[PDB]
Design a protein around this ligand. Sequence first.
Ligand SMILES: *[C@@H]1O[C@H](CO)[C@@H](O[C@@H]2O[C@H](CO)[C@@H](O[C@@H]3O[C@H](CO[C@H]4O[C@H](CO)[C@@H](O)[C@H](O)[C@@H]4O)[C@@H](O)[C@H](O[C@H]4O[C@H](CO)[C@@H](O)[C@H](O)[C@@H]4O)[C@@H]3O)[C@H](O)[C@H]2NC(C)=O)[C@H](O)[C@H]1NC(C)=O
Ligand SMILES: *[C@@H]1O[C@H](CO)[C@@H](O[C@@H]2O[C@H](CO)[C@@H](O[C@@H]3O[C@H](CO[C@H]4O[C@H](CO)[C@@H](O)[C@H](O)[C@@H]4O)[C@@H](O)[C@H](O[C@H]4O[C@H](CO)[C@@H](O)[C@H](O)[C@@H]4O)[C@@H]3O)[C@H](O)[C@H]2NC(C)=O)[C@H](O)[C@H]1NC(C)=O
Ligand SMILES: *[C@@H]1O[C@H](CO)[C@@H](O[C@@H]2O[C@H](CO)[C@@H](O[C@@H]3O[C@H](CO)[C@@H](O)[C@H](O)[C@@H]3O)[C@H](O)[C@H]2NC(C)=O)[C@H](O)[C@H]1NC(C)=O
Ligand SMILES: *[C@@H]1O[C@H](CO)[C@@H](O[C@@H]2O[C@H](CO)[C@@H](O[C@@H]3O[C@H](CO)[C@@H](O)[C@H](O)[C@@H]3O)[C@H](O)[C@H]2NC(C)=O)[C@H](O)[C@H]1NC(C)=O
Ligand SMILES: [Cl-]
Ligand SMILES: [Cl-]
Ligand SMILES: [Cl-]
Ligand SMILES: [Cl-]
Ligand SMILES: [Cl-]
Ligand SMILES: [Cl-]
Ligand SMILES: [Cl-]
Ligand SMILES: [Cl-]
Ligand code: NA
Ligand code: NA
Ligand code: NA
Ligand code: NA
Ligand code: NA
Ligand code: NA
Ligand code: NA
Ligand code: NA
Lengths: 388, 388
Amino acid sequence: QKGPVFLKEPTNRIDFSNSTGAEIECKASGNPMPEIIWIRSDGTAVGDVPGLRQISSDGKLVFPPFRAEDYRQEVHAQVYACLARNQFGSIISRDVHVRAVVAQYYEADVNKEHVIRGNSAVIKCLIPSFVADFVEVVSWHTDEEENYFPGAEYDGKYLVLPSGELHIREVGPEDGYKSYQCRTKHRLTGETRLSATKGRLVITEPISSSAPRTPALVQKPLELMVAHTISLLCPAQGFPAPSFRWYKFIEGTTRKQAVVLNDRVKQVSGTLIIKDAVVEDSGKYLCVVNNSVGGESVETVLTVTAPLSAKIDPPTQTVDFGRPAVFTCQYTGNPIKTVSWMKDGKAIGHSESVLRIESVKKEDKGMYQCFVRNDRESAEASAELKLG
Amino acid sequence: QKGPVFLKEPTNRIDFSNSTGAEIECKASGNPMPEIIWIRSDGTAVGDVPGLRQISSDGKLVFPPFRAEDYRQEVHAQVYACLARNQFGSIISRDVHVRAVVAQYYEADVNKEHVIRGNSAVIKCLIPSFVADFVEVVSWHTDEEENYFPGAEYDGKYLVLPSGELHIREVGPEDGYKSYQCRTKHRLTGETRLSATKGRLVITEPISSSAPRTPALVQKPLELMVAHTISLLCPAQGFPAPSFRWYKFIEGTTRKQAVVLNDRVKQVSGTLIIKDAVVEDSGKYLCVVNNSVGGESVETVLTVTAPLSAKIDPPTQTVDFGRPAVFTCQYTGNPIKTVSWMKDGKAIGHSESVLRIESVKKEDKGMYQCFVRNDRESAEASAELKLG
Ligand SMILES: *[C@@H]1O[C@H](CO)[C@@H](O[C@@H]2O[C@H](CO)[C@@H](O[C@@H]3O[C@H](CO[C@H]4O[C@H](CO)[C@@H](O)[C@H](O)[C@@H]4O)[C@@H](O)[C@H](O[C@H]4O[C@H](CO)[C@@H](O)[C@H](O)[C@@H]4O)[C@@H]3O)[C@H](O)[C@H]2NC(C)=O)[C@H](O)[C@H]1NC(C)=O
Ligand SMILES: *[C@@H]1O[C@H](CO)[C@@H](O[C@@H]2O[C@H](CO)[C@@H](O[C@@H]3O[C@H](CO[C@H]4O[C@H](CO)[C@@H](O)[C@H](O)[C@@H]4O)[C@@H](O)[C@H](O[C@H]4O[C@H](CO)[C@@H](O)[C@H](O)[C@@H]4O)[C@@H]3O)[C@H](O)[C@H]2NC(C)=O)[C@H](O)[C@H]1NC(C)=O
Ligand SMILES: *[C@@H]1O[C@H](CO)[C@@H](O[C@@H]2O[C@H](CO)[C@@H](O[C@@H]3O[C@H](CO)[C@@H](O)[C@H](O)[C@@H]3O)[C@H](O)[C@H]2NC(C)=O)[C@H](O)[C@H]1NC(C)=O
Ligand SMILES: *[C@@H]1O[C@H](CO)[C@@H](O[C@@H]2O[C@H](CO)[C@@H](O[C@@H]3O[C@H](CO)[C@@H](O)[C@H](O)[C@@H]3O)[C@H](O)[C@H]2NC(C)=O)[C@H](O)[C@H]1NC(C)=O
Ligand SMILES: [Cl-]
Ligand SMILES: [Cl-]
Ligand SMILES: [Cl-]
Ligand SMILES: [Cl-]
Ligand SMILES: [Cl-]
Ligand SMILES: [Cl-]
Ligand SMILES: [Cl-]
Ligand SMILES: [Cl-]
Ligand code: NA
Ligand code: NA
Ligand code: NA
Ligand code: NA
Ligand code: NA
Ligand code: NA
Ligand code: NA
Ligand code: NA
């Protein structure tokens, strides 16, 4: 009567501490009822590893809480998938990236920030790259007991940016007598802590003029989710204190247009702040920095991501021998890196949205799937071909 | 008998401290002898400012040593040029960027470096962007009195990179008990100093596996001179400790080829080191980082620069009325952003290497110039048109 279809698939990412453990679930319909098999996304079947990974009932793959000593990479840093299968054929779920992280001490640092008097300053909370997936800045604190939270600007001067930095307008020599520490939160342990070091502004008096200079290391391409607020920085120091202008390149050209500042898109000193991000905010942005001595510019690439989904039209069709079978994968999300097709769990080497079988023979019956992928996400849709 | 030609032009950059002062020289031939006028490159004539800028004899523009209090931006941060002129017409020299910098205290910092045991580490000497044009790393020093200089690797482990960082192979927990300071040199004052802070490696024990992660901020496009050694870094941390591969994109494509390691081009852990750089080393490079968990990559753009020069063929020609006059600008150097032509000191709106005057009329006699420019350098060539 029916080939398998997924009712419930596990999400693309399962991140958890060794204390929390995890369970992921896969449910499929069909007639006869499909067997549910857990595999590594590569295709190997996976089994029971005592205390670490348990195929449970209800179709649940269970990662019990475990001691640091019992960490196993092949179990705990692994991409899994669910394979649903009956006599009519096989479907494979989206990828399931499992990352069990053993609770472990980390610290964030705040270093000295050297600035020319009169310029803006950006104080950064430095989170080691290998924990940064799990740690975010909550708030900023000074020795004089000022506390700054994400939201509005304080005293026309201090702003905690959406990207976590503390932005300070128009630094004066008095600003060198404060030190700054950030509070960070680890989303897998739920713990918060203050930074191990405190940072201060070191203010240089402007005695010589100088053209704006930007740092050697600049923001690599960004990927940020729709509906969130984005901030693009443009760090630069010079004397006279420079002014800042943002542009967005016209895609595929060397031509650019001035970013249009309004209710949604605002500029704070050299920082561009985009609220309620939409996919069309993606692109290459250029910040141009000027004073009466000279100018400089830096490019930043932004991709605003949206969740991947896929659906095949039609869900099932019956086609008489020798006639054509067409399946159309319809998808949403951003970016889409690839579209690719599978038949009963095996790649069939077609990478376009519409799959056409010219003349249906007997071994063309079975389950077909469309997968849409980018670097972080995957989504699948399935469909059945029956012979008439 | 002759229009002006330059014998000696000032260099593109004149950087000097207020204690040193400076003089720049312009010499041109011609008959009658041309008057030498100093202008701002924009075209305004410049005069004597008592104690700060003196048109001297010998055709020298002199910036005397001066007190910090007497700094003047319009004098001391300015692009000048030499205008040579007689009855036959005018030529203007290449741009002369003058930067008088008042001697002023700076400090470099070395911060904590967080690394996973078994990975490579890179210790950086942080030089404020607004003095970095003048300050370079000389050497690195530890508390245990180890001294490291540019050149060869020490003990198979420590290397001071051409770009100034201290590279450390395969960090072990014992490496956390040393602290590091850099010695820097200011090329305008000639002073050396040690860094204000010392940095240490903070070593994280690998308890969980993790895919390689690279920092948020990455090297922006580089410009480095021919014949020097270049190092391209690829900072990355993960567990297992990752391996590194470098590629160079085929220009104008998304295709890449593996960099070929030999006597000139070497790899030290994740660092690519190119000796005796040539202009053909320019391009977009990709570093790909892998371990058994995952991978990442980062792009770096390199331009290898070569000094600009220009020459017009022919230096002088006589052309009878109504006939065609052709001047051909021949140039060398890299990159070349623009080529543009002038006649007696005024832009004539032609931006190609060959200038063709279709039918020579009377007001076409005069001095012609070709300018070749990029963001950092300019070179000019001149030629005379005489009527027959
Ligand atoms: C604020 O600060 C920024 C600096 O970051 C300044 O913006 C720069 O302005 C300069 C000067 O106008 C720009 O340089 C100009 O670019 C033109 C475009 O080049 C294109 O075409 C060539 C081929 O001919 C390609 O090589 C190139 O990649 C581009 O595709 C050039 O045509 C200009 O050269 C001509 O004019 C100059 C005078 O300006 C002459 O000296 C030349 O001989 C030639 O005739 C010129 O090089 C630069 O590109 C801008 N950068 C950016 C990032 O925008 C702002 O000007 C500054 N604001 C103020 C008020 O000063
Ligand atoms: C070391 O680490 C690096 C990671 O940094 C790995 O290199 C990456 O490898 C992956 C996997 O092969 C690469 O992803 C693949 O890229 C292909 C090329 O995409 C082009 O064409 C599409 C349009 O179809 C464009 O969107 C895109 O911009 C490119 O122009 C894709 O075709 C691949 O998808 C197909 O195969 C995969 C299985 O690999 C299926 O899941 C898909 O459904 C589809 O059928 C795939 O996405 C990635 O690009 C590499 N990155 C870099 C920087 O090189 C190394 O693999 C790793 N080494 C080892 C040994 O693991
Ligand atoms: C997950 O992994 C970590 C192992 O790093 C486990 O947390 C660690 O648990 C030990 C023992 O429970 C903790 O040691 C204790 O510290 C307190 C002082 O704060 C002391 O009074 C106790 O006698 C004991 O020595 C250790 O601090 C803790 N480490 C961290 C970073 O939290 C955790 O138990 C594991 N989860 C399991 C096995 O379910
Ligand atoms: C160029 O500009 C700087 C101004 O910043 C001048 O250097 C400064 O000169 C003053 C006076 O010569 C120095 O002060 C002295 O310091 C010593 C102690 O080290 C003290 O014994 C003296 O009595 C005096 O107070 C100052 O240190 C120095 N600053 C720097 C950064 O070098 C310089 O003279 C100027 N050049 C000229 C005017 O030609
Ligand atoms: Cl979902
Ligand atoms: Cl297998
Ligand atoms: Cl396994
Ligand atoms: Cl938000
Ligand atoms: Cl020269
Ligand atoms: Cl004038
Ligand atoms: Cl002036
Ligand atoms: Cl060198
Ligand atoms: Na069926
Ligand atoms: Na704007
Ligand atoms: Na179908
Ligand atoms: Na999905
Ligand atoms: Na003449
Ligand atoms: Na290689
Ligand atoms: Na000529
Ligand atoms: Na030159």
